[PDB]
Amino acid sequence: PSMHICLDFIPELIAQPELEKQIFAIQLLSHLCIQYALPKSLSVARLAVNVMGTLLTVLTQAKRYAFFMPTLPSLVSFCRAFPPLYEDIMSLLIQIGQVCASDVATQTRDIDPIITRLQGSMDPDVQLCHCIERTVIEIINMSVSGI
């Protein structure tokens, strides 16, 4: 029960260069926001989404996969905690979705997820797109059943 203190220094933690540390920070913030819903928690959850937007611009694809696949399922937790912090979530999700989609066409693929629009060990980008689709399904479900 004495772990709420983390909301103090998570802002300092995210500033660390190590992608591993930042990925951990966002994941931790996800569960802290669920358990505690305080103005400080939201003032930090907003910064989390802003940092994710920034790293979207500043990250090559080889690390974009490794940094976005294990942190995206964190966003449904933010949405569960804070309906107010919702349009930003959806904007970032659609942005990352279509940037990954655009990157997909650059090099020939065997599944070509584009035709899946009207709907194993695959390529990183295909995995990333499937992850984003799953997260959107999950956030829609949580919003429908969130009362």
Binding site: T57, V58, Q98, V99, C100, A105, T106, Q107
Partner: protein, 663 residues
């Protein structure tokens, strides 16, 4: 080989298929030499080449190497003889007693897949029946494969006739009449319809029976004449015949409509000439419809007998027969679509030609289209067309007495001074399919649209801009109706054939004006991919002119893809480094900013990219930019023979990926 005993050569080869003494490479080279001989023009050696190829393939299958392409090429269209020879070769090649399970399974699987490749069920059956095939392959697998091939059989019998639940001889006149009229409705043969209807008239009173299926329709123009017959029987027969045949024509069932209408012709011939003349008009209409549809849009050459009939019918117009605008416009469209420019305005110029606006407009269109090949800058017929269309689209009352708003044309379809209405001319044009006239009229309409219709001056591309710039009564015209109709016509011509870069450019410009940037890019890419074979060749600049590429830059920038904009920048004769940098500057990219650095092939923009990344502190991409620059393919100092090829290749790759992305 020195002598020419190729049969002995084949025998030696089949024996080697067991001995395994000869070198496989020797066999392959011998086959190549024999095929060279065949190419030299010795056709007799063709079957010998096939036989030796079969021997080589079977020999190879024993070891399990890949199958030569030449065997499949020769095997494209097998005959009985080829398959029998292959079977016999295999029979000699494998001896069951001195053969291992590995080889046995090898031959079994090879024959299985050869059969899978086969198409003719007779060949399937014979290859299955081959004794060696039976011995090698177990009956279970054989029957499974047989079932698989025969699963391509659409041999299913379907019942065409409707079911008649009513039972015959009902012992009740009322239900008997009901069943009889049901059969009458279901019937399509004119003779059987006549028999049923005459039986009904006989066993009933003198009551009209054409009012038995309300679905049946008859034009009000011809209803008076069709029902103005003293005899109930004859009037009902002719009414039902014409109604059913017209329904068949609407459904495009000319096979049965022809029979019904032809039967009605003889019946009406005994009656007044007026009715049979109307029925001959129906003949002309049905003939036009059957020619356009049944012979297909690819009708190479109309017989021209019905063309002469149409010519005479239009030029005569002697009697007071009620003529249908549908027939008139359809035949005028028919002649125009078949390019009967010989039948220009000079023929029957004043006899009712002005009375019927359809023929007037069609003849004017023919004159103005044949005016284009003429290099003279007369364009008098073009000016006439421009004036008639602008007056048609203009509101009759400038002061708008009917209503304050300029919605009279859009809703009331009145105040439409002119030979046609907008809807009428729309129907006329949709009846057309001639690319030349269609594109000329589209050019006219797009000009009418682009002449001072709004603040934006995004003048759409057009091929022949000869229409007058002067626009009298500019207030009267409705730019809104102009836009609606031009969009409709663009949608119609794309339906005619999307394979038209000229129309694709126009559609894309329309969407760009409407700010439908996604559609704009989509159709522009379709245009490029039509002009060249999906960019496997160099795109002619005539289509991708600098104006089009500038439109692309604007669309992409507003679509927020600031790396794709930079890639497109190179396509101009002079690169707009100003806009390239102004676009790369912003941080809101949405176009996989990193992965695209491979395609960019100008050293200067990459220098800009490296500076920007280093300044903003993004090393993971600074390194990518450095690598892209460092690549040897491009150095800005090569003899340009390699530079142009490299730029072409990168353009192809980028446009291919870009086309994959959209649509």
């Amino acid at each position: 080989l020195r002598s020419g005993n190729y049969q002995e050569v084949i025998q030696i080869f089949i024996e080697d298929n067991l001995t395994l003494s000869l070198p496989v490479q020797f066999r392959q080279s011998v086959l190549r030499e024999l095929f060279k001989k065949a190419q030299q023009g010795n056709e007799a050696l063709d079957e010998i080449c096939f036989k030796v190829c079969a021997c080589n393939t079977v020999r190879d299958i024993l070891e399990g190497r890949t199958i030569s392409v030449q065997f499949n090429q020769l095997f494209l269209r097998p005959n009985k003889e080829k398959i029998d020879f292959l079977l016999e070769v295999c029979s000699r090649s494998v001896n069951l007693e001195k053969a291992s399970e590995s080889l046995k399974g090898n031959m079994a699987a090879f024959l299985k897949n050869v059969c899978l490749g086969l198409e003719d069920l007779q060949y399937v059956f014979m290859i299955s029946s081959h004794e060696l095939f039976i011995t090698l392959l177990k009956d279970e697998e054989r029957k499974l494969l047989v079932d698989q091939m025969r699963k391509r059989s659409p041999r299913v019998n379907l019942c065409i006739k409707p079911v008649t639940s009513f039972y015959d001889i009902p012992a009740s006149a009322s239900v008997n009449i009901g069943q009889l009229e049901h059969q009458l409705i279901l019937s399509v043969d004119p003779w059987r319809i006549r028999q049923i209807l005459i039986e009904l008239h006989g066993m009933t009173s003198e009551r009209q029976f054409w009012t038995v299926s309300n679905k049946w329709e008859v034009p009000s123009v011809y209803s008076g004449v069709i029902l103005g017959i003293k005899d109930n029987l004859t009037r009902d027969l002719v009414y039902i015949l014409m109604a059913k045949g017209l329904h068949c024509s609407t459904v495009k069932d000319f096979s049965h409509a022809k029979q019904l209408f032809a039967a009605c012709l003889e019946l009406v011939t005994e009656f007044s000439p007026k009715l049979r003349q109307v029925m001959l008009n129906e003949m002309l209409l049905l003939d036009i419809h059957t020619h356009e549809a049944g012979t297909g849009q690819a009708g190479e050459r109309p017989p021209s007998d019905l063309i002469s009939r149409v010519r005479g019918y239009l030029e005569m117009r002697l009697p007071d027969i009620p003529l249908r605008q549908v027939i008139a416009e359809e035949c005028v469209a028919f002649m125009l679509n078949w390019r009967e420019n010989e039948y220009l305005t000079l023929q029957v110029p004043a006899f009712l030609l002005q009375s019927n606006p359809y023929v007037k407009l069609g003849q004017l269109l023919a004159a103005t289209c044949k005016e284009l090949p003429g290099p003279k800058e007369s364009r008098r017929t073009a000016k006439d067309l421009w004036e008639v269309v602008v007056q048609i689209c203009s509101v009759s009352s400038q002061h708008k007495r009917g209503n304050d708003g300029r919605v009279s044309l859009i809703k009331q379809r009145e105040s439409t001074l002119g030979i046609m209405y907008r809807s009428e001319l729309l129907s006329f044009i949709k009846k057309l399919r001639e690319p030349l006239v269609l594109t000329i009229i589209l050019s006219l309409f797009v000009k009418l649209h682009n002449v001072r219709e709004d603040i934006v001056n995004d003048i759409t591309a057009e091929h022949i801009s000869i229409w007058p710039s002067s626009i009298p009564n500019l207030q009267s015209v409705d730019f809104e109706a102009v836009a609606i109709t031009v969009k409709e016509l663009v949608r119609y011509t794309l339906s005619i054939n999307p394979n038209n870069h000229s129309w694709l450019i126009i559609q894309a410009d329309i969407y760009f004006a409407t700010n439908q940037y996604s559609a704009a890019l989509h159709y522009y890419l379709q245009a490029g991919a039509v002009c060249s074979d999906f960019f496997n060749k160099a795109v002619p600049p005539d289509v991708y002119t600098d104006q089009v590429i500038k439109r692309m830059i604007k669309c992409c920038s507003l679509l927020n893809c600031h790396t794709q904009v930079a890639i497109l920048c190179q396509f101009l004769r002079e690169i707009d480094y100003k806009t390239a940098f102004k676009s790369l500057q912003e941080q809101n990219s949405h176009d996989a900013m990193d992965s695209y650095y491979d395609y960019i092939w100008d050293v200067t923009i990459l220098e800009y990219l490296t500076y920007l990344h280093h300044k903003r502190g993004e090393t993971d991409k600074r390194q990518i930019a450095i690598k892209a620059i460092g690549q040897t393919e491009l150095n800005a100092s090569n003899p340009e023979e390699v530079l142009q090829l490299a730029a072409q290749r990168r353009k192809k790759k980028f446009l291919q990926a870009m086309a994959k992305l959209y649509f």
